[PDB]
Design a protein around this ligand. Structure first.
Ligand SMILES: C/C1=C\[C@H](C)C[C@H](C)OC(=O)C[C@H](c2ccc(O)cc2)NC(=O)[C@@H](Cc2c(Br)[nH]c3ccccc23)N(C)C(=O)[C@H](C)NC(=O)[C@@H](C)C1
Ligand SMILES: Nc1ncnc2c1ncn2[C@@H]1O[C@H](COP(=O)(O)OP(=O)(O)O)[C@@H](O)[C@H]1O
Ligand SMILES: Nc1ncnc2c1ncn2[C@@H]1O[C@H](COP(=O)(O)OP(=O)(O)O)[C@@H](O)[C@H]1O
Ligand SMILES: Nc1ncnc2c1ncn2[C@@H]1O[C@H](COP(=O)(O)OP(=O)(O)O)[C@@H](O)[C@H]1O
Ligand SMILES: Nc1ncnc2c1ncn2[C@@H]1O[C@H](COP(=O)(O)OP(=O)(O)O)[C@@H](O)[C@H]1O
Ligand SMILES: Nc1ncnc2c1ncn2[C@@H]1O[C@H](COP(=O)(O)OP(=O)(O)O)[C@@H](O)[C@H]1O
Ligand SMILES: [Mg+2]
Ligand SMILES: [Mg+2]
Ligand SMILES: [Mg+2]
Ligand SMILES: [Mg+2]
Ligand SMILES: [Mg+2]
Lengths: 370, 370, 370, 370, 370
């Protein structure tokens, strides 16, 4: 009767037991291995730190994110992360509860198969189910129709849905996300004379990004508006104590989402992946889709994304239709909350993958029940 | 179960058995050889005096320190010194106890290899271990994080550490120490008309240094404040009975630490070796390092070093951070006490270099277990 | 019709007028200030020596490199250096010729802006242009496609190019260079009992590095091959006349390039910055890039770098492709020669920044024409 | 336009007006006071004889050298000596000319301050300047680089210089000089049955020293070579008319310079003060220093010092370097001649201490202009 | 097992066999030759009288002291004296016992060499050794540290020693002694109308000196205190029976020791030879030396020497130190007693010069074993 909800992002792990309004444990997904040798006798090594503990001391550690673009690169690392979750933070047993793992649309079969296989074989779990992040956000928004476009560090989905039915041919993933905007925010931040070559320093960047970055209404405008610089430059204060001052970098760093040309990729921006994901949907549901666009996931937390996205689509799609982007407060957790509502539904209880069914049917069954 | 702790300095040897709060035998490391021929029949020659005995009669002897800048120049002399330690003062056997020898960071391999080799082959010892002085002081300070900057007659280390892990690339040694401040205090003391050309006389100087020397808050200030001389000149009274009076020499002798330009070396002073040793450490631990700086070793006993060092770093490093130099009472022994705490730890017992392991693995193994 | 080519390195300044096959003046970039006071009456002070003159007498001087990691730390010093170039060595006037200054990729805007500003305002120059070092080396190699990875004392670039087009997102700079391998060669050389604390002595080291250092094929092999030491130890003879003998230090000093772990930085080595700089390039040009890798800059002069780099990439990248590192003879000047060929091209004459255009458009225009 | 050069030695005063190739007046610095009462009526008392006059009649007088180890013991005596110089021998006025006084390195401030003070206040002089003897010898040698090691009766300097710059930390003074070799030549001469208890007799000794003393190539050799005595014993003929014969005393008297052990002092000999004064100089200038060693001052006039010093250093310093000791003819005056060349230089005229500047700035200014 | 101790003074010969507390034979060293011809038939001529016998009849004899200032002037005479010792008074054989001869510091080699040579060749002795008088007195005083300043008729030594080690450079001999105070006491005694031109009469003087002479506390005082003469004039009664009365001569005769100016020599007095002999000793032992000064030898027997010497040194040396002159009772024999204690020591037996070693090694060996 208690469903255990773990949504594995890239660069966050949000885990809380079902029925709560906000997740218990929110900690970045990081596996630190101390680079230099330990000296002081009596210290507890704990060879590989994990999660928040390992982001409290980042000066000693070489951090490796195990998830890059929503696809596990290194399993040992992830497995260790989950272990940290269930034991050190959720404080729930593996064998007692069913758990809900979350996954990205169009994600290689390898992640499903090997993900569950690692859940049943190494951990022991009674039942399991892995749902597309996008759709889960839609439960949270509590409405039955709309595009759900989320962007987490790894991946950015656009999954349209019409009145409860999902469109498998419309789904569209772009790879511009939080970690490409940080790994970009360095290439730009060099311009000012600052420079960050190291992992720990990359996370310092990520903080800069979260605090000081906004998205311009019209970028061509603001690039001119910054010639005369008054309140645009905000002073960020490092863990060091040195005082940085970031210029244009504030609004040209997050803009990479709308123009990927900057990052160098040939993909289309967010506005043309939303709009395009619609244009693949039949001409009859476009009304509802244009109406219900729901932002989700962290990367869209930037101040003023709603306005820019709306105006931009409106420019793209015919003027007759009203475009409304619903940007709910506390959307950073939308995927998780959707995990709660979903896992708490009385009819949903039929769909869990069962310890038995896995045992007899092999790990490949995951593909059939998703 | 009794660990024997010998910390070999340059110009002191502090030896006491583990578990004591202060070392049993503290005597300068000196090998006197009487220069003139002995006459009185029945006198006991004991050709080469050692330690305190040889500093009670310094008029007959030509003293030779066997350690110059923490690196053994002449082995026979040192070997003789240790011999004096274990037999005439510690009163412990060599073969009964394990002994802990202490060494300077970035110290030529020769001193490790040949040091142990002389411990196992000529003396017979069951087990042995040689630890960096800096880190040992940090156990004594009982805190797990901070810069430990010591200066003994030979050498001055800055070894930062963060939460039990040591940073091998940060370590920084400067060669300004007690013996360069005495050998300088002569070049200055000549200015007053006094002059000391001889070894014995050099030690007289060292006494002058210990008693009458303080470190100015702001040197440029005091050089002016001494134009009108009231209480600055203190009268020191020699073994001779003649009465010296030392002028500015009091505060411009120990200042050489902060400005090496005076001694002539091109190295940076103490404040820029501390601050620089930090700047090589990652931007994430700087908080803790700036906070926990621990003075250690004799040469920092000068009255008022804390204030000057703090203000000086604070001037160097960004003003936002609080700098606190912990100058514990009885820091002259910090390295030794750290020898006690360390050697008394239950987990440490695994690390000793074993008579066997040396016998089979050759003397080179020292480098692997330090 | 005569273009004046000055490529500002860190620790060298290579200046020669266009059309020559090798640069006229090659002298280290050093600003000496004599530390002690001058005595002999009638001597010509010339307060701050510069370049080769100041490396003929390094015993009196405290040397300060004005360029650290390709980014001017202290302008007065550099300005003085150039002055020394144009007047005392190139023997060309500033106002007569256009000059070509060279710069490092991803280099803070400050160096461009202030560099030209100092060229037009203090010196007077008719026209000016500042090109990325990497690309300039590629003209010299006379081929239109390849990675150009150079390492000068300050910086090491990897700038890929495909058939005349440059990839701005692929560029990758690492900070391991000649001066980190010298400043490291001390930390290691201490191990043998030698030690160099002073600037002048650092340059002595740099000589040791240039003459006696080679790069191992497989390092793990040679670390074993040195247990039995025959021809590995080479005897270097100081300006003093004392005879040093360097051990392993020969091949473990330059290896820091391939493993930065030694220096302590968390960056990837040279092989993974080359290989990684490729992996950011589209899958279609990889053929040409893997084929045409061009070593450049001084730091790669080490005997046997070609073999190690090739085998190492080959291990990294799929075996099907042939990797060929072109290591042209006289690659130390590749950047300069590229300065000659480039500045001598008939179409290039359109791109110079003009005295006028600077006067009206402010110093910021540099960013637009590079 | 005529500079007056007085170099105050211990046991000589060499005074001549600038521009001459050799000094006008050379007379020993001695203040005789007739011990017994005068009888013959009409004799001119002139209570205290001075200089050569007082060494023509030494039987009546008790001689007191006012300079002992280059530091004025008794001022009245010296003041009287100078007076004798300017009036009775130089025949120049005090008030007409600027005068150049000479002083020993590391000499107590008292001698500078009180020396000038006695020059401006009691004598009246327009301008004055006091230069280190060592450096002045170096002008005379006309070369810009080398160790200048002089030994006058009082003091023996080693002052290295590199290409016009002086090294203040290298300077090294030893106290073995002409007067310790005479006061020693008595302790040895007693061995033969001769003995000299009185001042006048001490000067007789000094003559013996000057005429009959040479320095052995290898002392241990000659101590054996004197067992069979042929030409080693030379017969000296006193003012008395009695005929002395001096044995080994010839070469073991001046050897005290190379071994101070004989005199009893703990200082190092001349060879280790030269060689050591080098070893304190940076490793870059050692070439030039080893090359240019310049003997100077009287005490080095001994026949065959060049050979012994050279071979001895060569034994000390690495064999690769050529050691050359330049022992110019007429080196007894080197300090003076250097006084001439220096005082005659057109740029030097700026440095004189001025009657005015002294009047306003107090006598302490001497320390600032030296 | 019986050591024969002969201490040859100038004007005494103190000979007694080892182990006695006071010497057996004490007789003046005099060789009388009767001047006039003998007449009475049957008288025993014994051409040259010696010692006490020759001082019982001094009217017939012309006395010649063979020792003048501790250096044998005439050998035949001395040889005869010893002969008188061993046969007529010690009553010991030459060949049976080893003998200890005593000598003055800084004494011409001639006296050592020829002294032993006369002991082994003419007399036959099994073993021999010749020790410095000063040091021997120090055994007698039974303390291991102090200045030993003795004055016998010939010579006055100051030989400092520190804790068993002797300082060869400190030794200092002055020639003011008993025989210069007698030969002076005549020049003064003439003043009163008495006069002694002849040898025998000189010895009468010496008696006057011994009995009636004291040393003033402050001489300038007493020269005034004698204007009113009460108890100062003491009446001495000659062998003649005539009654002398000596005036000031009492205290101005022995004062010549403290002021040699009177005798005419240029040497310093006793107080400045003690104090100066200290000042040549290192600044570290001065404490002990100032403390332990030991008077010795006859000439210091004068009533009240202790007080004057102490106050006088105290005036010379810094007031902080306590000066104590130990003037042991029966110090006239101190040198001899020291001969007993020394010769009776069990370890001393190794040092004797052996009949053999002399036979093979020639007489020169004496110099090596002293
Ligand atoms: C406390 C001491 C001494 C005294 C009791 C202290 C008092 C205070 O000195 C004086 O006032 C005397 C005078 C002096 C002369 C002039 C003057 O304006 C001030 C002082 N100074 C001298 O004669 C120098 C001579 C000297 C020799 Br050689 N080479 C040297 C090298 C450099 C400097 C000087 C010298 N001098 C006394 C010595 O070195 C002796 C060997 N010093 C000592 O070992 C100890 C006992 C130190
Ligand atoms: N308050 C914020 N403002 C701006 N960006 C943010 C903020 N919080 C997080 N981010 C960005 O979003 C990322 C977190 O996304 P997340 O919700 O974890 O996606 P996922 O759950 O799919 O990993 C962070 O790494 C950061 O780049
Ligand atoms: N009380 C004091 N005041 C000032 N300086 C001191 C004092 N005690 C010792 N020193 C200086 O410190 C030195 C002792 O340093 P030490 O603790 O022995 O270092 P190490 O143990 O590394 O040799 C002495 O030689 C002296 O120069
Ligand atoms: N012959 C050589 N062998 C090995 N290393 C060399 C050699 N010559 C130069 N170097 C290294 O390369 C550096 C010179 O690089 P340089 O070509 O000046 O780069 P930049 O022009 O970017 O400064 C030197 O400082 C030295 O460290
Ligand atoms: N011809 C000579 N041979 C040997 N020694 C000499 C000779 N002439 C002088 N001396 C020694 O050198 C001393 C003179 O040194 P001097 O040049 O006066 O030095 P300073 O000028 O510093 O006093 C003399 O006292 C004597 O001891
Ligand atoms: N009682 C005395 N009072 C004063 N002076 C004395 C006394 N006895 C001896 N002397 C002096 O001391 C001398 C004896 O000295 P002595 O002890 O023989 O010295 P040494 O043994 O070296 O010859 C005598 O010649 C005399 O001048
Ligand atoms: Mg997400
Ligand atoms: Mg220490
Ligand atoms: Mg370059
Ligand atoms: Mg001289
Ligand atoms: Mg005697």
């Amino acid at each position: 009767v208690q469903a255990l909800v773990v949504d594995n992002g890239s660069g966050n792990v949000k885990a809380g037991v079902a029925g709560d309004d906000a997740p218990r444990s929110v900690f970045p997904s990081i596996v630190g291995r101390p680079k230099n040798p330990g000296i002081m006798v009596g210290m507890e090594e704990k060879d590989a730190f994990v999660g928040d503990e390992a982001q409290t001391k980042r000066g000693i550690l070489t951090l490796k994110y195990p998830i890059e673009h929503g696809i596990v690169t290194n399993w040992d690392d992830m497995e260790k992360i989950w272990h940290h979750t269930f034991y050190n933070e959720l404080r729930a047993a593996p064998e007692e509860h069913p758990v809900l793992l979350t996954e990205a649309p169009l994600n290689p079969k390898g992640n499903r198969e090997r993900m569950t296989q690692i859940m049943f074989e190494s951990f022991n779990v009674p039942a399991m189910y892995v749902a597309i992040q996008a759709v889960l956000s839609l439960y949270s928004s509590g409405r039955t129709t709309g595009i759900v476009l989320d962007s987490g560090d790894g991946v950015s989905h656009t999954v349209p849905i019409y009145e409860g039915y999902a469109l498998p041919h419309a789904i569209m993933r772009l790879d511009l996300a939080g970690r490409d905007l940080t790994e970009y925010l360095m290439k730009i931040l060099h311009e000012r004379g600052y420079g960050f070559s190291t992992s720990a320093e990359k996370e310092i960047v990520r903080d800069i990004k979260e605090k000081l970055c906004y998205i311009a209404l019209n970028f061509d405008e603001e690039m001119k508006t910054s010639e005369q610089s008054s309140d645009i430059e905000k002073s960020y204060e490092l863990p060091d104590g040195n005082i940085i001052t970031v210029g244009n970098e504030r609004f040209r760093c997050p803009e990479a989402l709308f123009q990927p040309s900057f990052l160098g990729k040939e993909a289309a921006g967010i506005h043309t992946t939303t709009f395009n994901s619609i244009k693949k949907c039949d001409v009859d549901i476009r009304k509802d889709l244009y109406g219900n666009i729901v932002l989700s996931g962290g990367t869209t937390m930037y101040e003023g994304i709603g306005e820019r996205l709306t105006r931009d689509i409106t420019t793209l799609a015919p003027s007759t239709m009203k475009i409304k982007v619903v940007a709910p407060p506390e959307r950073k957790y939308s995927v998780w909350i959707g995990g709660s509502i979903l896992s708490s539904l009385s009819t949903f209880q039929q769909m869990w993958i069962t310890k038995e069914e896995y045992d007899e049917s092999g790990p490949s069954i995951v593909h059939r029940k998703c």
